[PDB]
């Protein structure tokens, strides 16, 4: 019954997810894995369905990790969906500062793909700016991809001076 739940959560079918989650005894099916190790929380957050991820958090799910260290917030920032992002941030605050296998945060992906409102949403909250495995901040990762709107809305922000402070004096690519 894991594959019907994965298909129903991956496409926002809310009534099928309510019918499958009627028996609330066993939660091993709720946080089960995939071939790529993604929970139904990850599938609902990847495509940006806010009511499904709200229902799964109300029934009780765990912020597990992908095989590549991703989280639900990493997928919601990779996609640029502000609603699911806002729901995940309104539930818990201990999920924001989180590293993948490469040291990126959600703000790194949200600045890399050029989603301005996602960067402003993670930046209105405390984002905990940190470097990469290659010592690249999110601002440099936005500048190397020529994303005009996100660096403009970082300039309009109030954290800009702090965003100016951090870089590496030794790397040739990051200056």
């Amino acid at each position: 019954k894991k594959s019907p739940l994965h298909f129903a959560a991956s496409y926002g079918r809310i009534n099928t997810c309510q019918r499958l989650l009627q028996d609330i005894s066993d939660t091993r099916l709720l946080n089960e894995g995939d071939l790529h190790g993604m929970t139904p929380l990850h599938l609902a957050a990847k495509n940006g369905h806010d009511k499904v991820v709200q229902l799964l958090l109300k029934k009780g799910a765990l912020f597990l990790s992908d095989h590549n260290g991703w989280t639900a917030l990493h997928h919601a920032s990779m996609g640029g969906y502000t609603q699911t992002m806002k729901v995940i941030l309104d539930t818990n605050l201990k999920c924001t500062d989180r590293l993948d296998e490469d040291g990126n945060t959600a703000l790194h992906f949200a600045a890399r793909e050029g989603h301005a409102k996602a960067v402003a949403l993670l930046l209105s909250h405390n984002a905990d700016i940190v470097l990469n495995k290659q010592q690249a901040s999110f601002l440099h990762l936005a500048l190397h991809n020529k994303r005009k709107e996100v660096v403009l809305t970082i300039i309009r922000s109030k954290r800009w001076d702090e965003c100016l402070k951090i870089f590496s004096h030794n790397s040739p690519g990051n200056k």
Partner: peptide, 16 residues
């Protein structure tokens, strides 16, 4: 609109 179609579509005899 296409994502809305998949969200509201009825699936019988193609499940699992």
């Amino acid at each position: 609109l296409i994502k809305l179609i998949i969200q509201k579509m009825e699936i019988i005899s193609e499940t699992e």
